[PDB]
Amino acid sequence: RRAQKHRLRELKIQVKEFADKEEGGDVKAVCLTLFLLALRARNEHRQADELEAIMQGRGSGLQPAVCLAIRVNTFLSCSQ
């Protein structure tokens, strides 16, 4: 960690300057949208919207009623 920090200290202070001069100390959303634009130009968007759902705060688990809905609609027994 400290090795790549030493390798990228210029980068950290550079986009630090750019964050203060563009949106005024807004490193989080700028660096986030940089990750999103890069990994969507990567054309592997499953990881991208996975990161979007996890950093927005989308819940992993779901409602019981939706489980009931999919169980009824697929006609599955309680054992399976």
């Binding site: 949106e23 807004d26 959303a29 700028v30 949208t33």
Partner: peptide
């Protein structure tokens, strides 16, 4: 904010 942008 930036999140509001496309």
């Amino acid at each position: 904010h930036l999140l509001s942008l496309t």
